[PDB]
């Protein structure tokens, strides 16, 4: 089923540690996935004003 942000949520029967380990890893990688506009802002702070 779809979520509010447009992501797809899959509800399945699965194990406990398999769910915990896999979903935690998703959170860690997603912490470092950012929009291109935010990346440009980060780049601009590390270069001279021109």
């Amino acid at each position: 089923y779809p979520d509010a942000d447009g992501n797809d949520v899959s509800i399945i029967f699965s194990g406990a540690m398999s769910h915990a380990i896999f979903t935690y890893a998703q959170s860690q990688w997603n912490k470092n996935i950012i929009k291109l506009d935010d990346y440009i802002r980060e780049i601009t702070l590390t270069v001279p004003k021109q």
């Binding site: 797809d8 899959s10 194990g15 406990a16 540690m17 398999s18 380990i21 896999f22 890893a25 998703q26 990688w29 997603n30 470092n32 996935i33």
Partner: protein, 50 residues
């Protein structure tokens, strides 16, 4: 009778050797088996049937 089992493999541990050391070595193997050691995004919105 019926039951549900989560099969994550069998990982033996030696009593004399350090448990944290063995757990760390097994963690690298488990991450490779689950395919979550490298940056990834889950793409599981297409596997459905209507």
């Amino acid at each position: 009778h019926a039951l549900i089992k989560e099969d994550l493999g069998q990982w033996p541990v030696e009593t004399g050797i350090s448990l944290v050391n063995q757990a760390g070595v097994f963690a690298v193997q488990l991450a490779n088996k689950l395919g979550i050691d490298k940056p990834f995004v889950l793409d599981a919105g297409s596997n459905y049937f209507t």
